[PDB]
Amino acid sequence: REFAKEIDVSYVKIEEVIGAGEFGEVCRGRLKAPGKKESCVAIKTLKGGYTERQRREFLSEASIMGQFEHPNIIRLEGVVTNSMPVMILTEFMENGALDSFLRLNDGQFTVIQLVGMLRGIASGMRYLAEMSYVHRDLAARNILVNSNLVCKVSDFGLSRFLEEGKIPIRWTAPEAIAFRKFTSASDVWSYGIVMWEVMSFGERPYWDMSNQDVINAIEQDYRLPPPPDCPTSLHQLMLDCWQKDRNARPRFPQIVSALDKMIRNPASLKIVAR
Numbered sequence: 203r204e205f206a207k208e209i210d211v212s213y214v215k216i217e218e219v220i221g222a223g224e225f226g227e228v229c230r231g232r233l234k235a236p237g238k239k240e241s242c243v244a245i246k247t248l249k250g251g252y253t254e255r256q257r258r259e260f261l262s263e264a265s266i267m268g269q270f271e272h273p274n275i276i277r278l279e280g281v282v283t284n285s286m287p288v289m290i291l292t293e294f295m296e297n298g299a300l301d302s303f304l305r306l307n308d309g310q311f312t313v314i315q316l317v318g319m320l321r322g323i324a325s326g327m328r329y330l331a332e333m334s335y336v337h338r339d340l341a342a343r344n345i346l347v348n349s350n351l352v353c354k355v356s357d358f359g360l361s362r363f364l365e366e367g368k369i370p371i372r373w374t375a376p377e378a379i380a381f382r383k384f385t386s387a388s389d390v391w392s393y394g395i396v397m398w399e400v401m402s403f404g405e406r407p408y409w410d411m412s413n414q415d416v417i418n419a420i421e422q423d424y425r426l427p428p429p430p431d432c433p434t435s436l437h438q439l440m441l442d443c444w445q446k447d448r449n450a451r452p453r454f455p456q457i458v459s460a461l462d463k464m465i466r467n468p469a470s471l472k473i474v475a476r
């Protein structure tokens with residue numbers, strides 16, 4: 203009902219539309235509140251004719267995001283709910299979604315930069331797992347990137363999938379597909395997919411395979427191969443995330459530690475397949 207970051211609409215200047223989201227436009231804007239310096243924000247607006255259900259679904263993202271505070275989790279800067287249009291303001295992420303940012307920059311960041319991106323994502327997920335929050339839709343298209351290449355987890359919501367939007371099959375652990383048991387360990391499977399997306403500069407997981415083909419292949423022991431030039435130690439970490447037995451997967455603290463070791467010992471990334 204009441205949001206801790208409700209903000210006066212006169213503190214918001216909406217500037218250009220920069221994207222399209224689930225419920226409407228996403229805009230760049232400026233937030234200037236009394237006693238505070240002006241900051242850049244992204245602004246999601248809910249416009250026109252919408253159900254009350256849609257309004258609650260839209261605002262639920264702000265409710266959840268506002269529970270979190272971490273450098274690798276998108277920060278909620280405020281909401282406008284006492285007036286129309288309804289708005290969610292977040293920190294602005296100059297480079298947008300990670301998957302499209304990497305496709306635009308194919309081959310143009312080094313392995314150590316890519317590992318730093320993956321470390322930031324893993325740190326955000328380490329925090330969510332410690333908060334007992336299961337993301338369920340962890341994918342490169344849900345990671346946002348700032349000007350300094352800091353990656354932050356976005357897309358928050360506790361609504362059930364249609365089977366319980368649809369389950370994102372290509373990112374989802376097999377026990378979550380089969381039994382609808384979503385845990386931080388299923389999040390780890392998804393994180394392995396994100397690693398593959400990052401090291402492939404935004405290629406689509408499983409290329410042209412259908413959803414049922416992916417489900418069957420995973421059950422039949424297929425796993426995505428190392429992306430071109432991918433250090434074998436990073437592919438092995440992906441394979442660890444993709445263990446069928448959820449209890450055998452590394453947990454997020456382990457994943458962060460493994461990436462931190464690579465950053466400290468970059469020579470360990472030189473080994474590549476073939």
Ligand SMILES: Cn1ncc2c(N)nc(-c3cccnc3)nc21
Pocket residue numbers: 220221222223224228244276292293294295296297298346356
């Ligand atoms: C560029 N930027 N900066 C922050 C931000 C956000 N929270 N959400 C989105 C967003 C969300 C959904 C669809 N398109 C863009 N973009 C953002």
